[PDB]
Ligand binder design. Structure first.
Ligand code: P9C
Ligand code: P9C
Lengths: 411, 411
């Protein structure tokens, strides 16, 4: 029976370019949302997003290799290097074969897709870059990291839209627990703040259009919420078999004890009022970890700030938590960070792990006036200290009705 | 210890719109390659591909739901309905929660990506379809099928480029074997025969440009080969826990006994001369199934028809097979079908299963003059009868150096 622990963290987010700076900003209630200035937003209903500030990879990726990568890949590689360095793991000929990666994205390389298509429209196919395919496809972050570190173990990339982060991390764990690997770098990366991303989620009526107050736009469970806020970034964890971790004297952030999956089988872009899929995913993670809902002290919600989605998850938590629903803390960091899509569940799993280490839960900012009829504690406005918290639960849900939940355990 | 069997098959390919018609064409050595006529190829170095002929979904998808889906999704849904019907499984309230899907794609919705981007360039973001995101993203085939059949179990989508088919099928099996599900519809779908797909793989110098003889273009291991041939389609299998299958009187095509993964950690778009990654993936599948290379009677190769790729896999087979290398049969159906990318490993896993049922192996057509120095039997030109074949092995490799191998066992 192989246990899986977390021994390395890496991250780029709209509120910090490292794991610790991001976590600190979150506990301080800082918003990373701002007006977009990299493309003309005049014709766009939504003109703001959670952008990665002053992104720097000069020292990690040549400007030469950079030409072959969409920004999402650059972000994922930087976050993965952060996590690999953080873990302190040394790759050897003996080891190589037992270390792999499970890294995905929800939409992949929109920026270079648009650049190559513009080139084709303007000058014909001869203007398409030789790097079109490898610079835009989802699995390219795992591709570059394995090459960079000489990892020859299993490499997969799960693209389950907004649930990708959670699924890649959960399957990395399954892979290790099954015996196919002893270490996996896992998570997700996304850079969808482009004309097609903003225009596309906007065409669907899914984004907040509160342009006059971008930082107040993301407000999960608030009565005035009007859609999600796009966020860019990457989150990466180094997962590792327990005995392997101890043997090398690794620092252990927490243990990954449960992973649950489910499907809504309801609608392509909306959950059922019931939240029955979200509930099933949580129920499965609890069963997988062998614990009762009452043992969870904090739920890092999917909480995207949409009218129907927030309501469904609140119903799901009430259903799974029952009596303890008032005792469990629930918050949505998307209130500050925006929605990282395929990387959401990866950065949020990190927040869930840090909550265990620091015994402190970040708030749902902007929660001025919560929906009526709900007795859940969404940790409005300010961080909250916790006492003897042993388990946290991270949810991620996605278009296509695909859901996932992870459960982390202290020590 | 839960065993996984295959109880349903579905498929659309350039040589047939059903599983049986496709298999028959393959055993007859028929090419499905033709000149492209749906877009003007004047400026294109490659002007042919393996197209799905007379695709029909009128009776499976309304022309209304169709408007919300890229062709790859339409293909995957039709193949998945074929597999679900073939399995004879009945979905109940009791069952729903235990049936899921693992379906992916390598590039996803290129056609609608291009249509929406053209619309944005011509008329601004207001012209982007509300269906842009859900009509192009990778996980949408699993999304629609779960909704269509009321499946509430685990749903994932692996996007590992040209290895997707094999990885989705292997992880569907892991999911069932772990206990997270009793049935999974799994496979891949692709429709990359578009300006960006043909122009994009063409910019990379990876496609054959033998326009004067499209049907002779795909010629794995042949001295005159000059790159892969793009193919469109979908392959889907219904995987199911053994006891669950027997209990309902399911028809069982074969058993899935081994799944191996590996990474080349070499180059983003080319394997090492050594084929050491391909070898490791095969070695891992053999270990997973608990058998020796000598027990395999047929290898459905990745064999894409590129100068470097074919050579590497031939080296890998020689390495893993050793003495038995001359005794094992190896063929590449891409010689006829073209390269289905994310769906390649899914359709090829089907070919691998049918080879067991019929005791017949399809040929590598166009193999007029094999590379020198290789003593492998690539089954040139004509199908071959086999005698007491108990195991087949299917390989799929992809950009990013990601590899996978599956092993199927008779009965
Ligand atoms: C067809 C509609 C209905 C519509 C507008 C479009 C878009 C969406 O479907 C829906 C939204 C905006 C979003 C529902 C939702 O939360 N989907 C969802 C999800 O299922 C999984 C993950 C995520 C994520 O962001 O990771 C996510 O957003 C809503 O609130 C009600 C509203 C709506 C408007 C007017 C009348 C009725 C309903
Ligand atoms: C940088 C280059 C080198 C180049 C041209 C570009 C494209 C590619 O890389 C390579 C090709 C065309 C393809 C190598 C390959 O098989 N990649 C591959 C793979 O790693 C996994 C899966 C698949 C699949 O199709 O599923 C696949 O194609 C070759 O043969 C030699 C040739 C080349 C030309 C001139 C000099 C040296 C080399």
């Amino acid at each position: 029976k192989r246990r899986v622990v977390v021994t390395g963290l890496g991250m780029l987010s709209p509120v910090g370019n490292t794991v610790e700076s991001t976590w600190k900003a979150l506990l301080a209630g800082q918003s990373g949302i701002s007006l977009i200035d990299h493309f003309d937003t005049s014709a766009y209903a939504t003109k703001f997003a959670g952008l990665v500030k002053d992104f720097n990879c000069e020292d990690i990726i040549s400007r030469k290799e950079q030409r072959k990568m969409d920004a999402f890949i650059q972000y994922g590689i930087v976050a993965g290097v952060q996590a690999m360095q953080d873990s302190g793991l040394e790759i050897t000929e003996e080891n190589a074969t037992r270390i792999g990666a499970a890294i995905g994205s929800g939409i992949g390389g929109l920026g270079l897709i648009e650049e190559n298509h513009t080139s084709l429209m303007n000058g014909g196919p001869r203007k398409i870059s030789p790097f079109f395919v490898p610079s835009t496809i989802v699995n390219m972050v795992a591709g570059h990291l394995t090459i960079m570190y000489g990892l020859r173990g299993p490499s997969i990339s799960i693209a389950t839209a907004q649930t990708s982060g959670v699924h890649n991390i959960g399957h990395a764990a399954r892979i290790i627990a099954y015996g196919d690997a002893d270490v996996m770098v896992a998570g997700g990366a996304e850079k969808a703040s482009t004309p097609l991303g903003v225009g596309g989620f906007g065409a669907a009526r899914a984004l907040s259009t509160r342009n006059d107050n971008p930082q107040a736009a993301s407000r999960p469970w608030d009565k005035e919420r009007d859609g999600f806020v796009l966020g860019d970034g990457a989150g990466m964890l180094v997962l590792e078999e327990y005995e392997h971790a101890k043997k090398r004297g690794a620092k252990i952030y927490a243990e990954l004890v449960g992973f649950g999956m489910s499907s809504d089988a309801y609608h392509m872009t909306s959950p059922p009022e019931n939240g029955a899929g979200a509930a099933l995913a949580m129920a499965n993670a609890l069963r997988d970890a062998g614990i009762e809902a009452s043992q969870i002290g904090y739920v890092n919600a999917h909480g995207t700030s949409t009218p129907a989605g927030d309501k469904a998850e609140a119903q799901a938590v009430k259903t799974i938590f029952g009596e303890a629903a008032s005792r469990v803390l629930v918050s949505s960091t998307k209130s500050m960070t925006g929605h990282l899509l395929g990387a959401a569940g990866a950065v949020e799993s990190i927040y869930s792990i840090l909550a265990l280490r620091d015994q402190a839960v970040p708030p749902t900012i902007n929660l001025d006036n919560p929906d009526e009829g709900c007795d859940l504690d969404f940790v409005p406005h300010e961080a909250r200290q916790v006492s003897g918290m042993e388990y946290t639960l991270c949810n991620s849900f996605g278009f296509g009705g695909t859901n996932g939940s992870l459960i982390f355990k202290k020590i």
